[PDB]
Design a protein around this nucleic acid. Structure first.
Ligand SMILES: [Mg+2]
Ligand SMILES: [Mg+2]
Ligand SMILES: [Mg+2]
Ligand SMILES: [Mg+2]
Ligand SMILES: [Mg+2]
Ligand SMILES: [Mg+2]
Ligand SMILES: [Mg+2]
Ligand SMILES: [Mg+2]
Ligand SMILES: [Mg+2]
Ligand SMILES: [Mg+2]
Ligand SMILES: [Mg+2]
Ligand SMILES: [Mg+2]
Ligand SMILES: [Mg+2]
Ligand SMILES: [Mg+2]
Ligand SMILES: [Mg+2]
Ligand SMILES: [Mg+2]
Ligand SMILES: [Mg+2]
Ligand SMILES: [Mg+2]
Ligand SMILES: [Mg+2]
Ligand SMILES: [Mg+2]
Ligand SMILES: [Mg+2]
Ligand SMILES: [Mg+2]
Ligand SMILES: [Mg+2]
Ligand SMILES: [Mg+2]
Ligand SMILES: [Mg+2]
Ligand SMILES: [Mg+2]
Ligand SMILES: [Mg+2]
Ligand SMILES: [Mg+2]
Ligand SMILES: [Mg+2]
Ligand SMILES: [Mg+2]
Ligand SMILES: [Mg+2]
Ligand SMILES: [Mg+2]
Ligand SMILES: [Mg+2]
Ligand SMILES: [Mg+2]
Ligand SMILES: [Mg+2]
Ligand SMILES: [Mg+2]
Ligand SMILES: [Mg+2]
Ligand SMILES: [Mg+2]
Ligand SMILES: [Mg+2]
Ligand SMILES: [Mg+2]
Ligand SMILES: [Mg+2]
Ligand SMILES: [Mg+2]
Ligand SMILES: [Mg+2]
Ligand SMILES: [Mg+2]
Ligand SMILES: [Mg+2]
Ligand SMILES: [Mg+2]
Ligand SMILES: [Mg+2]
Ligand SMILES: [Mg+2]
Ligand SMILES: [Mg+2]
Ligand SMILES: [Mg+2]
Ligand SMILES: [Mg+2]
Ligand SMILES: [Mg+2]
Ligand SMILES: [Mg+2]
Ligand SMILES: [Mg+2]
Ligand SMILES: [Mg+2]
Ligand SMILES: [Mg+2]
Ligand SMILES: [Mg+2]
Ligand SMILES: [Mg+2]
Ligand SMILES: [Mg+2]
Ligand SMILES: [Mg+2]
Ligand SMILES: [Mg+2]
Ligand SMILES: [Mg+2]
Ligand SMILES: [Mg+2]
Ligand SMILES: [Mg+2]
Ligand SMILES: [Mg+2]
Ligand SMILES: [Mg+2]
Ligand SMILES: [Mg+2]
Ligand SMILES: [Mg+2]
Ligand SMILES: [Mg+2]
Ligand SMILES: [Mg+2]
Ligand SMILES: [Mg+2]
Ligand SMILES: [Mg+2]
Ligand SMILES: [Mg+2]
Ligand SMILES: [Mg+2]
Ligand SMILES: [Mg+2]
Ligand SMILES: [Mg+2]
Ligand SMILES: [Mg+2]
Ligand SMILES: [Mg+2]
Ligand SMILES: [Mg+2]
Ligand SMILES: [Mg+2]
Ligand SMILES: [Mg+2]
Ligand SMILES: [Mg+2]
Ligand SMILES: [Mg+2]
Ligand SMILES: [Mg+2]
Ligand SMILES: [Mg+2]
Ligand SMILES: [Mg+2]
Ligand SMILES: [Mg+2]
Ligand SMILES: [Mg+2]
Ligand SMILES: [Mg+2]
Ligand SMILES: [Mg+2]
Ligand SMILES: [Mg+2]
Ligand SMILES: [Mg+2]
Ligand SMILES: [Mg+2]
Ligand SMILES: [Mg+2]
Ligand SMILES: [Zn+2]
Ligand SMILES: [Zn+2]
Lengths: 69, 101, 77, 110, 141, 116, 181, 53
RNA sequence: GCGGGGUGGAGCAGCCUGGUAGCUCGUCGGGCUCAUAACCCGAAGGUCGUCGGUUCAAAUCCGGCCCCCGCAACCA
RNA sequence: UCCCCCGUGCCCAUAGCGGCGUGGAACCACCCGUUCCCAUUCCGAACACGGAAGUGAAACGCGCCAGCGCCGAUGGUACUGGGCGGGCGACCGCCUGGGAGAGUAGGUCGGUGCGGGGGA
RNA sequence: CGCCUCCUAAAAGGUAACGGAGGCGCCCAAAGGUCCCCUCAGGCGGGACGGAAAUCCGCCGGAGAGCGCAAGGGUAGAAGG
RNA sequence: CUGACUGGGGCCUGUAGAGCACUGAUAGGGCUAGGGGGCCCACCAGCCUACCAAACCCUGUCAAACUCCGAAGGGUCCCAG
């Protein structure tokens, strides 16, 4: 490479909020992230976060079977 | 030999026989008298191709099957005269030279 | 009635000046042209307006080298 | 459809012929470096020299300088002195520059 | 009627009418044809007259093929002017037609239906014509 | 961005900042700071990276927020519009939905007056 | 040269599994990475504040490599563009710096992305290459909220030695690209 | 040659004689032309300077 | 035949010097009035007669066709 | 004197597009590195250097196939130099010498010079 | 009304008409010398804001681009960048 | 003895004729963007088109300022009458 135009690469410490640490190289020796590959919802198989909804509607009402027949 | 009378013909149409033969690679010992064609299904303006050509034994097609072979098209009509004489035609536009091209 | 045309330019008398097998002196003009219809070959200079002229005394020869264009040469006598 | 290698090749070679000299054309492969002096008026090669024919050693750059002193050595024996350098697609530098300088010390004129 | 939709040049020199046709000399589309026996500039006004006549015989039916096209611009100086002051103005368009061309071909019609419209068409033309039907010679070109 | 997917306003108290998120209101703010034992009074700039990730982890995991929240509500109207409900036609003609007079006002749904 | 995780992972896990699924008869027949090119079609800096050293300083930190300029090929009226005007940046990553960038890209960037639901399956060249877009450069780890004046994403082109999309798809998924469908 | 594209001379900066005449666009090139040219008097090259025609 | 011209609804600018469409009236919505006018406050509407060309870009520069104003058309 | 490869020419698509197959001992290439010479409007991609673990995957070289491209008769015609007739013309004929273009048959998946390196 | 380009012009050069069409009366301090490197228009596919069209990647593409300005000739084995 | 003319030989050319590969024109057919039309929709897509019609392919044609071709002739130089 040309000298004096290039940011310098060093061993880097990317930290996640799950406590995943990643061994890599970067222009900054230490970085923290909010999220990573090791914990993300879409990422971890199909960990369907806050909603394992299945909708639930619309057959789902069912309140109740008390209307007469 | 376009066997059949097209439905396009029975409504007033005309069977535009584009190819009255077709080019073909074949052995001398294998000369067909013709090749039959079913045009009875054709409407205005429906058409058959070299692809739709059903071939006798031992004879291979020598053109692109994309080639059109027969068509049924609208007839002439005196009723179109009214529009055709009253259809306006403009004076011709010169393709330019110079600071015009 | 009037013409918006009327004009044309002076003819420039272009073309080959010396044909193959003709004996020329160094300096003689061989071909006058617009662009390289013919290209300078051995012993043949080309001037700023494409004019091919002989660099040595001798005899003209043409050569048609296909996609390489046509060439004019002078062979030393 | 030509390539930068091919075009650059014609580009310098065409300018060399026009000056009418004998051409010291140089081929440089990954391992070896060859050089032949050609009379383009006959389509004919008059003298050659190559590392591969001289069975030479290691350092490509010194190898070049040596195949250079070689080419001249055989050359002056045939009366050849004036000649012109065909750097082909190769930038005048490194291995090729070295062969050239070898040819010069040898006395070949350019 | 027929005329080019646009052209590189507005006015065309007159040229010549020597020789038989360069092509257009064989039946190519329809069943019967009208062929020119002598050279001429056939005008768009005639081509349309001839065309209209043919559709007028057929009434309902048939297909008409026009194999000539008026692309040559026709010039005339304005009435009563003297020679000079430039080329005349374009006043019409003509089809340059030499001996042996097919100008019109018909299809989808009885033979008497075709002989007759081609005949009536023929009267509308400034030249002599011959009616021809498709032969294997036409087939073979 | 910090939490959640957005970077809440630093220099405000931690409870107010949270409401700068689509999906978390004043209630849900004090509610997240209860179940994490975080002081509702402290400025966001003064959170521990510990306090951050705890507060982070609760909120993101309990409630649908920013993107997906918009997405369902979208699909909710999407379906209502598409079943042909009365509330659907009102969304599809862009008019109000909740039994308001339209003869006057109604502007917020209608937009600036298209005078005649 | 550098030992890094993805570069290592390619030879160790990606290489063999690929030779499995498609059964190549030559080592060079099997899919490789050639280059990842990063681009910022910018052009917001056409006139205005054609000082984009802020984004060249950005991209230089993201990739550890100084970007080059792109300039207008032709003048455009509707875009307000003088021919030759400076309208974008482009850095070409090969070899070690290519891996390191993809490494941080796959492990960090795409996660930090707004409502990430997987890379687009269909952004495949047809000749086995892949391209994707970014709305924000904040998506990376080396660019904090502080050091930015405005939102500026980028174009990302990754070239393979593959011939079909299918070998390309596999090479990239095996490396660690998250596809939705 | 025009109102904006003016004619001019080059003066040998050493012997002060004008040996060459040329032109320029004084809008595109407002400074005085400076060029080295062979001066026939000094019999060598000299920086020559644009002077009023 | 020579010169000038066509731009919201009416009548004129902008064209020469290419990038940006302006003025008065009129129309529409509001106000004063019992009401109307006047007057006051806001607001719409020209894709520049056409088709072609030059240009990065044309109401603007160049060509074609169309319509309008003015002048000429004399010795015969 | 024959075969293969590396150079460098000539002929200027009968040499080209595509498809299939083949070659790594040798030569060539990719290849292994980026210390050094040198280099990137960024990038050892290019150019360049020092190399020799692998591979003929890309490239190249060598073969095969007539789908495309390219070349293409014989015959006949158009036209025509010169010599004669005919028509009011537009135009049309004969004699002698020259003779296309299209199309048809058909050919083509190159030939050859010089110098190197290897093999018989 | 002088000059340049094309056609008329009958395959050397030349060739008229108030015949058919267009341009010039400038320009460039680099748009000049030379050394070194580089190859276009366009089509399909792929790409945040991004459009028919900005910039980016790939494949096809002998020149249909470019060469200040009219036209012709020339031209990437460069006269183009 | 070098001349008009003539024989042989080389080189030069873009006409007659022809051709459609370029620039344009061009009738019908195929295929098919774009619109127009008729169904169904405003939830945004769809389907039919005896409608006008781009680009491409086919058939068939035109051109002083079109040429992938291309004569007979003509010009010039050498040797000879
Ligand atoms: Mg101009
Ligand atoms: Mg007049
Ligand atoms: Mg006039
Ligand atoms: Mg004239
Ligand atoms: Mg003249
Ligand atoms: Mg003259
Ligand atoms: Mg002239
Ligand atoms: Mg000549
Ligand atoms: Mg010169
Ligand atoms: Mg010059
Ligand atoms: Mg010869
Ligand atoms: Mg010679
Ligand atoms: Mg030879
Ligand atoms: Mg005449
Ligand atoms: Mg007449
Ligand atoms: Mg006339
Ligand atoms: Mg008049
Ligand atoms: Mg006249
Ligand atoms: Mg006239
Ligand atoms: Mg007429
Ligand atoms: Mg005819
Ligand atoms: Mg008659
Ligand atoms: Mg034919
Ligand atoms: Mg909130
Ligand atoms: Mg209500
Ligand atoms: Mg895809
Ligand atoms: Mg960031
Ligand atoms: Mg690939
Ligand atoms: Mg008005
Ligand atoms: Mg003015
Ligand atoms: Mg102005
Ligand atoms: Mg009012
Ligand atoms: Mg009032
Ligand atoms: Mg333009
Ligand atoms: Mg404007
Ligand atoms: Mg315009
Ligand atoms: Mg325009
Ligand atoms: Mg006008
Ligand atoms: Mg009067
Ligand atoms: Mg070789
Ligand atoms: Mg060879
Ligand atoms: Mg091949
Ligand atoms: Mg093999
Ligand atoms: Mg091979
Ligand atoms: Mg080997
Ligand atoms: Mg081996
Ligand atoms: Mg190694
Ligand atoms: Mg170093
Ligand atoms: Mg060292
Ligand atoms: Mg390398
Ligand atoms: Mg191979
Ligand atoms: Mg090579
Ligand atoms: Mg064979
Ligand atoms: Mg040929
Ligand atoms: Mg032939
Ligand atoms: Mg013959
Ligand atoms: Mg005669
Ligand atoms: Mg005759
Ligand atoms: Mg004869
Ligand atoms: Mg004969
Ligand atoms: Mg001929
Ligand atoms: Mg022939
Ligand atoms: Mg072949
Ligand atoms: Mg040999
Ligand atoms: Mg040998
Ligand atoms: Mg003058
Ligand atoms: Mg002439
Ligand atoms: Mg001529
Ligand atoms: Mg002439
Ligand atoms: Mg003369
Ligand atoms: Mg003038
Ligand atoms: Mg410069
Ligand atoms: Mg220059
Ligand atoms: Mg320079
Ligand atoms: Mg392109
Ligand atoms: Mg694209
Ligand atoms: Mg987009
Ligand atoms: Mg784009
Ligand atoms: Mg060009
Ligand atoms: Mg004598
Ligand atoms: Mg003599
Ligand atoms: Mg004589
Ligand atoms: Mg003679
Ligand atoms: Mg002719
Ligand atoms: Mg054509
Ligand atoms: Mg054809
Ligand atoms: Mg003609
Ligand atoms: Mg001509
Ligand atoms: Mg001609
Ligand atoms: Mg001849
Ligand atoms: Mg002549
Ligand atoms: Mg003669
Ligand atoms: Mg002769
Ligand atoms: Mg004599
Ligand atoms: Zn994590
Ligand atoms: Zn002096």
């Amino acid at each position: 490479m040309k000298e004096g135009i290039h940011p310098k690469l060093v061993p880097a410490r990317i930290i996640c909020g799950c406590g995943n640490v990643i061994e890599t190289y970067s222009t900054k020796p230490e970085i923290y992230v909010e999220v990573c590959s090791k914990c993300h919802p879409f990422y971890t198989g199909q960990q369907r976060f806050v909603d394992t909804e299945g909708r639930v509607e619309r057959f789902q009402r069912r309140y109740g079977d008390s209307y007469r027949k | 030999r376009f066997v059949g009378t097209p439905a396009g013909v029975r409504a007033g149409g005309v069977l535009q026989e584009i190819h009255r033969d077709i080019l073909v690679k074949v052995s001398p010992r294998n000369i067909p008298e013709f090749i039959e064609v079913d045009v009875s299904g054709l409407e205005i303006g429906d058409s058959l191709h070299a692809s739709d050509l059903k071939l006798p034994p031992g004879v291979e097609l020598a053109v692109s099957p994309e080639e059109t072979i027969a068509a049924v098209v609208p007839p002439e009509d005196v009723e179109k005269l009214a529009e055709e004489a009253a259809a306006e035609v403009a004076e011709p536009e010169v393709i330019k030279k110079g600071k015009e091209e | 009635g009037s013409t918006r045309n009327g004009r044309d330019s002076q003819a420039k008398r272009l073309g080959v000046k010396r044909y193959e097998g003709q004996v020329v002196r160094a300096g003689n003009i061989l071909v006058r042209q617009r662009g390289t219809r013919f290209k300078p070959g051995k012993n043949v200079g080309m001037g700023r307006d494409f004019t091919l002229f002989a660099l040595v005394d001798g005899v003209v020869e043409f050569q048609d080298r296909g996609r390489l264009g046509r060439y004019v040469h002078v062979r030393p006598l | 459809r030509l390539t930068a290698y091919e075009r650059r090749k014609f580009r310098v070679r065409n300018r060399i012929k026009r000056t009418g000299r004998l051409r010291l054309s140089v081929f440089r492969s990954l391992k070896h470096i060859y050089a032949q002096i050609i009379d383009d008026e006959k389509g004919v090669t008059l003298v050659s020299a190559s590392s591969l024919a001289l069975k030479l050693k290691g350092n490509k750059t010194e190898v070049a300088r040596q195949v250079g002193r070689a080419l001249a050595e055989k050359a002056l024996a045939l009366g050849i002195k004036q000649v012109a350098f065909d750097r082909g697609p190769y930038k005048y530098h490194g291995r090729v520059k070295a062969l050239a300088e070898g040819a010069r010390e040898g006395g070949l004129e350019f | 009627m027929l005329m080019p939709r646009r052209m590189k040049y507005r006015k065309q020199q007159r040229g010549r009418l020597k020789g038989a046709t360069k092509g257009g000399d064989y039946v190519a589309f329809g069943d019967y044809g009208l062929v020119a026996l002598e050279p001429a500039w056939i005008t768009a006004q005639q081509i349309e007259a001839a065309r209209v006549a043919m559709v007028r015989h057929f009434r309902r039916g048939g297909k008409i093929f026009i194999r000539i096209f008026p692309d040559k611009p026709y010039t005339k100086k304005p009435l009563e002017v003297r020679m000079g002051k430039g080329k005349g103005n374009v006043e019409g368009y003509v089809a340059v037609v030499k001996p042996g061309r097919v100008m019109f071909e018909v299809a989808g019609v009885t033979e008497e239906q075709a002989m007759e419209a081609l005949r009536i068409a023929g009267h509308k033309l400034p030249i002599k014509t011959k009616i021809v039907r498709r032969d294997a010679y036409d087939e073979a070109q | 961005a910090r939490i959640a997917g957005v970077e809440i306003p630093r220099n405000k108290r931690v409870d107010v900042a949270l409401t700068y998120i689509y999906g978390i209101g004043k209630a849900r703010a004090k509610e997240a700071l209860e179940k994490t034992g975080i002081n509702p009074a402290t400025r966001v700039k003064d959170l521990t990276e510990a306090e951050v990730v705890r507060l982070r982890e609760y909120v993101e995991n309990t409630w649908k927020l920013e993107g997906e929240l918009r997405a369902e509500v979208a699909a909710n109207i999407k379906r209502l519009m598409d079943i042909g409900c009365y509330r659907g036609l009102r969304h599809r003609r862009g008019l109000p939905v909740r039994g308001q007079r339209t003869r006057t006002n109604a502007r917020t749904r209608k937009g600036p007056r298209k005078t005649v | 040269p550098l030992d890094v995780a993805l570069k290592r992972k390619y030879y160790e896990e990606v290489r063999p599994e690929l030779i499995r699924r498609f059964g190549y008869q030559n080592v060079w027949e099997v899919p490789r990475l050639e280059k990842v090119v990063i681009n910022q079609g910018l052009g917001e800096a056409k006139e205005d504040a054609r000082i984009l050293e802020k984004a060249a300083q950005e991209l230089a930190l993201i990739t550890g490599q100084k970007p080059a300029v792109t300039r207008a090929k032709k003048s455009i009226s509707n875009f307000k563009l003088r021919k030759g005007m400076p309208i974008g940046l482009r850095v070409t990553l090969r070899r070690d710096r290519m891996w390191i960038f993809l490494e941080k890209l796959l492990n960090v960037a795409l996660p930090r992305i707004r409502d990430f639901r997987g890379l687009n399956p269909n952004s495949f060249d047809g000749r086995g290459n892949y391209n994707l877009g970014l709305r924000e450069q904040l998506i990376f780890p080396e660019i904090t909220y502080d050091m930015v004046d405005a939102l500026r994403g980028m174009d990302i082109a990754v070239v393979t030695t593959a011939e079909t999309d299918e070998e390309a798809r596999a090479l990239l998924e095996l490396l660690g690209f998250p596809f939705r469908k | 040659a025009s109102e904006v594209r003016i004619k001019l001379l080059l003066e040998c900066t050493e012997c002060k004689r004008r040996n060459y005449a040329t032109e320029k666009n004084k809008r595109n090139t407002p400074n005085k032309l400076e060029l080295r040219k062979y001066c026939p008097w000094c019999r060598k090259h000299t920086v020559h300077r644009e002077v009023k025609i």
